[PDB]
Amino acid sequence: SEESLKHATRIIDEVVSKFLDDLGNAKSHLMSLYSACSDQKFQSIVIGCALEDQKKIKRRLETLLRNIDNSDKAIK
Amino acid sequence: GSEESLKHATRIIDEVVSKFLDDLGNAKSHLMSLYSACSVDQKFQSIVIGCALEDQKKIKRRLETLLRNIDNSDKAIK
């Protein structure tokens, strides 16, 4: 029993840690795109956009980062 | 050009978000799989069977809590 507990916990801990890793990549991927405004192929696409649309893009990235921060926060 | 650049830049963000939602979906299906092994995955179900009955409930409960939390991670993405 004592050993089984730690085993089941390990199996669950892996699924969660993996999810948190994926949550971490999307977050850094989102940050790299953001700094590409405020990563390399995105930056080059951003300049071809009109300033108004560059404002929207940045804003969207900001909002997304807040959203994914709440996603991380959801995992207690 | 500008509205075309919009579309290009917009779908690159969409793909990053989309890959995250798929990753979230995979965590959810994997937790659901382990949970219905309590409520199938033999390897996990066997490990739990060996758990003290009380410990079993704790495990099942963590799974329920994680599946609830993950649903909140999901809804957080607008």
A67:B77 CB<8 A: yes
Residue owning tokens 């050009």:
B1
- Distance (Å, whole) CA B76 – CA B73: 5
Resolution (A): 2.5
Sign of CA dihedral A42, A47, A53, A59: positive
| φ, ψ (nearest 5 deg) of residue A28 | -70, -35
DSSP assigned state of B2: H
| φ, ψ (nearest 5 deg) of residue B44 | -80, -45
Q: Which of A11, A15, A10, A7 is nearest to A75 (CA)?
A: A15
- Distance (Å, whole) CA B78 – CA B15: 14
Out of B10, B17, B50, the one facing A4 most closely (by C-beta) is B50
Mutation target vs A (from B3, B4, B5, B41; most A CBs, 10 A cutoff) = B5
SS3 per-residue string spanning chain B: CHHHHHHHHHHHHHHHHHHHHHHHHHHHHHHHHHHCCCCCCHHHHHHHHCCCHHHHHHHHHHHHHHHHHHHHHHHHCC
Q: Write out the DSSP string of A26-57.
A: HHHHHHHHHHTT--HHHHHHHTTS-HHHHHHH
- List chain B residues with CB under 8 Å of A3: 50
Q: Which domains does chain A have, with CATH numbers?
A: 1-76 (1.20.58.890)
